[PDB]
Amino acid sequence: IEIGENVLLEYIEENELKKAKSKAVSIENNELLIAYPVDVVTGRTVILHNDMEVTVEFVGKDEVPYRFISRIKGKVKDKLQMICLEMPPREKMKRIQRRQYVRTDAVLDVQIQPEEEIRTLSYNISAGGIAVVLADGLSFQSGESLRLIIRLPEEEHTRQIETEAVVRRIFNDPKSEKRKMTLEYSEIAAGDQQALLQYCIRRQLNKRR
Ligand SMILES: Nc1nc2c(ncn2[C@@H]2O[C@@H]3COP(=O)(O)O[C@H]4[C@@H](O)[C@H](n5cnc6c(=O)[nH]c(N)nc65)O[C@@H]4COP(=O)(O)O[C@H]3[C@H]2O)c(=O)[nH]1
Ligand SMILES: Nc1nc2c(ncn2[C@@H]2O[C@@H]3COP(=O)(O)O[C@H]4[C@@H](O)[C@H](n5cnc6c(=O)[nH]c(N)nc65)O[C@@H]4COP(=O)(O)O[C@H]3[C@H]2O)c(=O)[nH]1
Secondary structure, eight states, rough: OSSEEEEEEEEEEEEEEEEEEEEEEOOOTTTTEEEEEEEEESSSBOOTTOOOOOOEEOOOSSOOOEEEEEEEEEEESSSSSEEEEOOOTTTTOOEOOOOOOOOOOOOEEEEEEEEOOEEEEEEESSSSSEEEEEOTOOOOOOOOOOEEEEEEEOOOOEEEEEEEEEEEEEETTTTOEEEEEEEEEEEHHHHHHHHHHHHHHHHHHTTTO
């Protein structure tokens, strides 16, 4: 559970599966109150018809994602229109895991090249994707295929991993006002990917104690 966190809904309206993003207000007794149901892609608000079985997703205080089916109990009026969601038990609230590959926060040398060539740094990495800090002026696009070269330092032997990856998303970090960008490996060698895989596990393992 948490408060103020994002509550992601997934319902069926007019035979197609629509998703929406709301905000946790309170979880009094067995009822969850969410506010401002806006569409996941459309910034404009939406309407959740009562008694509609929805599928609620959220990230708890343990940085673990949770998913449960529920129902629109009804509207609640106190100063705004908030939607009442019937909460399940504490069982029947399945913890999910959407990442195929284990991620680790590592500042690695990344070289992006589509005009010239951009040598930059990553801020987290995975065996299937990468997230990289951009400088101002760099113009890319979600869906553009880029060739990037990753300097993976597997101890003394510095492995150079060359892949092609497609831009997932570009956003502005509210903590640094610097552009960040994420990519998914379009094509990566089996040898390099396995090494990159064992690197992220050991690196994540080396900080448990
Ligand atoms: N579309 C998309 N967005 C991404 C992805 N990775 C990160 N983000 C965005 O970045 C936020 C912070 O992620 P984080 O620092 O890894 O911190 C995350 C992460 O540590 C944890 N978490 C959430 N879902 C998963 C998961 O499926 N697997 C794992 N291992 N951790 C998760 O909860 C934190 C909060 O996640 P959110 O509230 O979702 O907020 C996420 C999400 O909005 C991605 O692969 N796809
Ligand atoms: N290192 C790194 N790699 C990134 C990031 N964003 C995307 N990627 C790469 O791109 C793949 C596709 O992510 P997606 O299309 O957002 O699709 C995502 C998203 O829909 C969902 N997902 C995973 N983690 C999160 C999360 O933390 N928050 C949310 N909201 N969704 C997530 O599962 C899919 C992720 O599958 P993956 O095995 O993670 O595979 C990811 C990952 O390899 C990032 O911030 N850092």
